[PDB]
From Swiss-Prot, chain A:
Function comment: One of two assembly initiator proteins, it binds directly to the 5'-end of the 23S rRNA, where it nucleates assembly of the 50S subunit.
Subunit structure: Part of the 50S ribosomal subunit.
GO term, biological process aspect, one: translation
GO cellular component terms, A-Z: ribonucleoprotein complex; ribosome
UniProt keyword terms in alphabetical order: Ribonucleoprotein, Ribosomal protein, RNA-binding, rRNA-binding
InterPro entries in the record: KOW (IPR005824), Rib_uL2_dom2 (IPR014722), Ribosomal_uL24 (IPR003256), Ribosomal_uL24_CS (IPR005825), Ribosomal_uL24_KOW (IPR041988), Translation_prot_SH3-like_sf (IPR008991)
Protein name: Large ribosomal subunit protein uL24
Record-level Gene Ontology MF annotations: rRNA binding; structural constituent of ribosome
A Pfam family this chain is assigned to: KOW
Coiled-coil annotated residue ranges, if any: none
Family: Belongs to the universal ribosomal protein uL24 family.
UniProtKB/Swiss-Prot annotation, chain B:
Family: Belongs to the bacterial ribosomal protein bL28 family.
Annotated keywords: Ribonucleoprotein, Ribosomal protein
GO CC terms, sorted: ribonucleoprotein complex; ribosome
Top-rank taxon: Bacteria
GO biological process: translation
Single GO molecular function: structural constituent of ribosome
Keyword Ribosomal protein listed: yes
Pfam families: Ribosomal_L28 (PF00830)
Region Disordered, residue ranges: 1-27
Name of the protein: Large ribosomal subunit protein bL28
Organism: Enterococcus faecalis (strain ATCC 700802 / V583)
UniProt cross-references to InterPro entries, sorted A to Z: Bacterial_rp_bL28 (IPR050096), Ribosomal_bL28 (IPR026569), Ribosomal_bL28/bL31-like_sf (IPR034704), Ribosomal_bL28_bact-type (IPR001383), Ribosomal_bL28_sf (IPR037147)
Segments of skewed composition (Polar residues): 9-25
Keyword Ribonucleoprotein: yes
Length: 101, 61
RNA sequence: GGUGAAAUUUUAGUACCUGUGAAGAUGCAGGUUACCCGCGACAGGACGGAAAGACCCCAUGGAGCUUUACUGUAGUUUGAU
RNA sequence: GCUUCUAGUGAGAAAACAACUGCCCGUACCGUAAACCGACACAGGUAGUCGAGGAGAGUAUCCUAAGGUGAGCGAGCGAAC
RNA sequence: AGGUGUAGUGGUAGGAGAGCGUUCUAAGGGCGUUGAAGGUCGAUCGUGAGGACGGCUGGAGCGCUUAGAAGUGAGAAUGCCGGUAUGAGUAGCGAAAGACAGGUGAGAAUCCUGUCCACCGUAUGACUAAGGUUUCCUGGGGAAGGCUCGUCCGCCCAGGGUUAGUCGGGACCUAAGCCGAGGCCGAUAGGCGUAGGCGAUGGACAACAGGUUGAUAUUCCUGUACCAGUUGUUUUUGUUUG
RNA sequence: GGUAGCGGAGAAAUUCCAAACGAACUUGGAGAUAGCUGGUUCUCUCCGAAAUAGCUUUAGGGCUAGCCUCGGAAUUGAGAA
RNA sequence: GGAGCUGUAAGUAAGCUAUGAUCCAGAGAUUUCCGAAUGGGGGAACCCAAUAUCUUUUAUAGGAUAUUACUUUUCAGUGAAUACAUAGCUGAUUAGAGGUAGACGCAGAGAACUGAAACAUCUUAGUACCUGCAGGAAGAGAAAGAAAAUUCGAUUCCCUGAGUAGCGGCGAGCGAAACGGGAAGAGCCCAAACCAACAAGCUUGUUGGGGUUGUAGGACUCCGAUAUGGUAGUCUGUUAGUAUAGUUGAAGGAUUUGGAAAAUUCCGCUAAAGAGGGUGAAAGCCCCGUAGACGAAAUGCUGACAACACCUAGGAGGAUCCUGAGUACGGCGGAACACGAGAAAUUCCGUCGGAAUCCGCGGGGACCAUCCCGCAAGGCUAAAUACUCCCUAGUGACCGAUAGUGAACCAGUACCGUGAGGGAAAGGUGAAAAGCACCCCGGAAGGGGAGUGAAAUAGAUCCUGAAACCGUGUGCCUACA
């Protein structure tokens, strides 16, 4: 996927549009990703999971990878990714500014 | 098979035709005889058509 | 009290007599009788159900059988080669 | 299989005792059946063995022994048929 | 474009004409989360097939115009498939004895225990071949199955259970029959058949009694045996007129 | 264990050959053929029959003619009363 | 190839991965047992051996690996009646043995219903079925041809000829061919004469040479050139391309509505890319892509190039020799030819008889003469043609779950049948499980709240949710018909 675990991304569509977070996990086969503080769901858990009250747990649910744009670390703005060869290492380049990753 | 060892003659099918031209299937067989011939240096009894023996170039040892 | 089918079934608020009519009508005509809903019984009718009558006839249908029917033919036999 | 006979084969044989070796498959359970064949936990069908006592010719019959069973809807009522 | 006048306008088989609606294609022009199709309701319009417009439901698509192509229109075929009725709360619930006490449990005529009663007993007992193939045991379960019920079950769930030199089968034997090297025969395919085999329902063949587990036992264990063979020890006698 | 459908087997009944045997079952030829029965789906408008003759292995089938319908041509108007 | 991965399938558990995992493509290794099966047996997936070597145990028992079917081809060795032999026998060697793609090809064998308005000729058909053999294609093919415009110059297939000529209980029906126009094109090797060598009993075989045909050719005898051209040869390399993984690949933000925007409005931009798919509704500019550019360690496949191999002589002479025999052909009986015995040529099968041979032989639809055209009884041969179980990329005024494959779903399954064989039903929560914590009645099932959600009368028998059918409420009516 064009987005990777640990990337800083901005949500461009959804209820959490314009939120920004780190990718906690990527699901390449599903084209989905989890972003901190995005698409939180209230889950009604029975206490069979070592939580001796059960409670309603707040977790992040995956969002489609096309709803997220990687943030330009040098610029703080979301940008599309290009693949240019640097040092013979194929890397992602910010289409907007030319920064790497 | 019941086949002439030298010329390959064998049983085939023909038609009986009546005067009314009714057609029924018949067999038509060659005139095969058990003959002792010198096949590749050895005598042996093989089927041979009377036609193959007509010329006299086939052994009759 | 529990459990729970089936054949059948165009819709049916589904009487009697005489008559009528595809000539034997619960349903048409005339008249007569009959408050509404059931339960246990009986089978006269619904030409009741079941089976596209087996009898009968028909189809230039089928099948099995017979023979001095026709035409063939396995087999058998006789001659030529 | 076994027992004999020589032909062949033979350098070793046998006895006693001691120690030791011996593979694969089946081996549950039902089986006059609710567990098999009958579409059913179906009044049918299913080879062979054992199959007790009294009376008795008897494995008949009636009641019983060892043993097994009360059987997969019941409660009333005590009409017709 | 229409108007007037006269006349005509029942109809099966059937001929002719002109249309309605369905799906798709093309172009154009449009409508849709401010709610498409579909569903449902309404007192709406047209000469007919049929067409709108609203409310509700619904949640994504779909009209209109012109032309094109069609798996294009259903009420009947003892039509096919599905669903659901009627008969009905009706027939039936499959050959027979049960009763009560106590228990278990949310719940018991129906499960457990007890007692008496009753039934089979050349059997409804005890074995075993076949067949079945886990139905066996233990602990749970009560949706479905069980012709009622169910706390129970040959059902469901979770675990477990089948131990042999001697039993039966193979490493033994052959019968019927079958297969069949070469072989014989035959349009093909193949048919038959000798040697040689396969093949029991028969022949041959070494252990028994008791005990033991919830479930296996001539299989495990105890005691006491037997059959084939192996290694070693001692004892005898034979080494090629052996 | 043997005999298999143009067959087998039959103390013989058209008897049996996997719950229908004058000739099993299955698949295929195959959408056999069916002058027979049944079925054949929207609308309106115009017109509208026949159930006869002849021939027919023809008689509940068919063919030509007659009768219906649509289109067309044309004449000293040939039709009807 | 570059960050996750340990399939469907979650769950826990335990792990792997920048020393490059999972994944992707090429090439290898492993590949139990059954099955042609093939050491022997057998009721497939089991059982039981021999021989050799190794291993286990003190040893027997046990284990491992290898070899061992049948027939064929060739060689060797043994070796009967039986003298030499031969057969048999043992070993080695060599090659088949089965399956398919339910298709296409050739061949053997070969129906019936049916049509003829009956039915035996005929038709259905040389079809279905069975069997053999194949090959990627097969078959056919290099004139004993087609003709008679005068000529054409192997075969195959397409158009046409033509529903013509014909065949036919002259019924029903069956039904050409050549010419003409196209696709594609390609030609070659033997036998014999003769020569040489060898072996054998002057010929009589083996080998090599020679030779290949119809305006006749060749042998042979003369001279004369050892050139020039061609190829339907080979795991001969080299090279390029190509298939089988991939890399790169432009351009949008706000605003209104909404749970969500891609819808809307506003201004922008990109286009060799406005094919298509996905994304919380309908996106050229968010994602995968697309146009375009680019990429191969390995293994195939193809084309060249090179190598090597294999073919390729002109002219003049006829004295003699050769040019496919039990063949051609004929009688008889069948069959194939569109052609049903017919006036029936041409081709073939069975049976019997049976030629000529260059001054020859065959055909020109009985037959003869003349003329013309060809040269059988030997073989091979690419392309144009047929088909698609599979593979890759696509297409559709094709289907959209009673359709479309029987099968969208764990289907040739469940189920039925002794067996061959017959053969189903069954797709959809939501954008995301966020699949209803907790409470309440209940043994549970199931409900009621509370929550999640845009919506749960979307709660899993989950989108929509028609009708039959079943029920609850009640505006009006109903117990003399
Ligand atoms: K009537
Ligand atoms: K009655
Ligand atoms: K009959
Ligand atoms: K046991
Ligand atoms: K007594
Ligand atoms: K007794
Ligand atoms: K009971
Ligand atoms: K009573
Ligand atoms: K009575
Ligand atoms: K509406
Ligand atoms: K119907
Ligand atoms: K019913
Ligand atoms: K009812
Ligand atoms: K229980
Ligand atoms: K044993
Ligand atoms: K026995
Ligand atoms: K009998
Ligand atoms: K007319
Ligand atoms: K085998
Ligand atoms: K195929
Ligand atoms: K026929
Ligand atoms: K007919
Ligand atoms: K060929
Ligand atoms: K034609
Ligand atoms: K006829
Ligand atoms: K040559
Ligand atoms: K998106
Ligand atoms: K798009
Ligand atoms: K390559
Ligand atoms: K002829
Ligand atoms: K000719
Ligand atoms: K010629
Ligand atoms: K909904
Ligand atoms: K009502
Ligand atoms: Mg009357
Ligand atoms: Mg009357
Ligand atoms: Mg009335
Ligand atoms: Mg009236
Ligand atoms: Mg009746
Ligand atoms: Mg009748
Ligand atoms: Mg037991
Ligand atoms: Mg019983
Ligand atoms: Mg009128
Ligand atoms: Mg639609
Ligand atoms: Mg239709
Ligand atoms: Mg209907
Ligand atoms: Mg009743
Ligand atoms: Mg009972
Ligand atoms: Mg008693
Ligand atoms: Mg008795
Ligand atoms: Mg039990
Ligand atoms: Mg239990
Ligand atoms: Mg019950
Ligand atoms: Mg034994
Ligand atoms: Mg045999
Ligand atoms: Mg053989
Ligand atoms: Mg024998
Ligand atoms: Mg014994
Ligand atoms: Mg027991
Ligand atoms: Mg009789
Ligand atoms: Mg019977
Ligand atoms: Mg047919
Ligand atoms: Mg009229
Ligand atoms: Mg084997
Ligand atoms: Mg006929
Ligand atoms: Mg891009
Ligand atoms: Mg926009
Ligand atoms: Mg013919
Ligand atoms: Mg001739
Ligand atoms: Mg002849
Ligand atoms: Mg010439
Ligand atoms: Mg070819
Ligand atoms: Mg289907
Ligand atoms: Mg549907
Ligand atoms: Mg289906
Ligand atoms: Mg709703
Ligand atoms: Mg629903
Ligand atoms: Mg009154
Ligand atoms: Mg009143």
């Amino acid at each position: 996927m064009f987005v990777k675990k640990g990337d800083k991304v901005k949500v461009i569509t959804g209820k959490d549009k314009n939120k920004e977070g780190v990718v906690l996990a990527a699901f390449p086969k599903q084209d989905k990703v989890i972003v901190e503080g995005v698409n939180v769901v209230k889950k009604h858990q029975k206490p069979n999971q070592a939580a001796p009250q059960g409670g309603i747990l707040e977790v992040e649910a995956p969002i489609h990878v096309s709803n997220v744009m990687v943030i330009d670390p040098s610029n703080g703005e979301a940008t599309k990714v290009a693949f240019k060869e640097v040092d013979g290492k194929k890397v992602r380049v910010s289409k907007k500014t030319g920064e790497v990753l | 098979a019941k086949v002439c060892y030298f010329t390959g003659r064998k049983t085939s099918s023909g038609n009986n035709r009546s005067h009314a031209m009714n057609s029924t299937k018949r067999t038509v067989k060659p005139n095969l005889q058990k003959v002792r011939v010198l096949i590749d240096g050895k005598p042996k009894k093989v089927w041979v058509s009377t036609r193959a023996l007509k010329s006299g170039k086939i052994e009759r040892v």
